[PDB]
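INTERNAL AUDIT FORM
Audit reference: QA-55
Scope: verify that the stored structure record matches its stored sequence.
Auditor: D.O.
Record contents follow.
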Amino acid sequence: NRSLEEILNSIPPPPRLMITHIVNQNFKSYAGEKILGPFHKRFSCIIGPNGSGKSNVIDSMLFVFGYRAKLSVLIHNSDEHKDIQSCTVEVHFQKIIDKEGDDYEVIPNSNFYVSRTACRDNTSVYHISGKKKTFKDVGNLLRSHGIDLDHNRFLILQGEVEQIAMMKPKGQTEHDEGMLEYLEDIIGCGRLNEPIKVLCRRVEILNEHRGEKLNRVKMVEKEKDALEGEKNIAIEFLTLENEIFRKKNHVCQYYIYELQKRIAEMETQKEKIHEDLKLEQIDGHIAEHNSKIKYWHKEISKISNPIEEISVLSPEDLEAIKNPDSITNQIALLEARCHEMKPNLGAIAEYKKKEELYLQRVAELDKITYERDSFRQAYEDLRKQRLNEFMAGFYIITNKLKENYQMLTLGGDAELELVDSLDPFSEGIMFSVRPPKKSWKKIFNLSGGEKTLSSLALVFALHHYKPTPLYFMDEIDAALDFKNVSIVAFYIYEQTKNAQFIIISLRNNMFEISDRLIGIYKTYNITKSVAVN
């Protein structure tokens, strides 16, 4: 359970190649060893009647590339040849320079030689140029060439296009994926768009309770504020009673100075008596010593300070018996305060503990909250950036789709209608198709051929957006007018010259645009092929 910051730091970031020849030994449709024909960089076709084994080959290339659908069906399956111990199929790849003229000047270096030996013991082993490997290494070198194998887009079968004609706009379950999520994978966002959505979701819920933590560190705060206010009143009472107590020490010091000033005056008078009668001076000395005995209270032990410290006006302000208000009001104030003291440092303790240290906890949860808001808006920025890239590529491919549909249908427009313009990730994207010289209507009331024509228009749109060098089609000519067949054949011939198109059909135009015509026939259940032009 890494933090989202560690997660957001750890974010994983988001001439041509031709097939020279294919040789197949103990192949499912080929008896013994058969060499497939040469394939031009421009065009090639495998034309013939249905049931000659073309479907067997196009499923075989899925089998040999790791796409799995008793490994004896992988070997030949017929009457004359039936399930020998192993089959070996080899395909040759070479580069070729992209020239506008009709050239077959390949690069003589063999780029790839993928040989799969599939035996009857449920074991299939892959070799690249005879080196015992997997299809993963061939796939990595194809990704170096810009070709992605496990993200399959280059192969089109029929079951895909009659899936396309009745797609839900979104994949409502884990086993369904709409064109929205598949395009999100295509555009390069689905690696980081949806996982960051689910990741921020849970973290924000964890963050919520952190905001709740910030709440219940001080859920009410009024009880502690009232308690520290009362104890602050007690502390201010302590300081004020200390000041009144200092005044009381001053008043007791006024009593000691009244006694001592009286002592000094009577020393002066008894010294006058001694100057002038002896026993009268002795009586003055006795009363002076009695007052010095009574002077013990000069060490005022109340706070010992005003104990020995005198005020300014010694003959007038330094007597306590002449000011009974100073005697009475100060001790009355002291008694009222000491009755009303209840002192505690809980004002300071609660202020430094719950108004500062729990405020420090609130500040730490404020920092966690700033992390939470930074995480949620870094999410909002990343999700909106991936969404903006997704709808930007979506606008690019819909412009390419609409221009392809306009030049293929020679009129009319098929356009994808969003559920909502802001974010079509809610429940999908609908599709509305207009046939030429027809009213604008839903796709559901239209022909299946119109749906397939819009699907091939989108396929042309994604190929124009992202150049995939290989494309495979099968039996598009059925239930379709020859006009659109020749139109898309002319599109494939004219707009694409480097891109190689392989189509399985019987109508003339799809191989009249073809540079290679691989005429394949099965005579006495022995399959032989010729490569005519």
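Auditor finding: record pair retrieved intact. Residues 210 and 365 are 7 Å apart (CA to CA).
Action required: none
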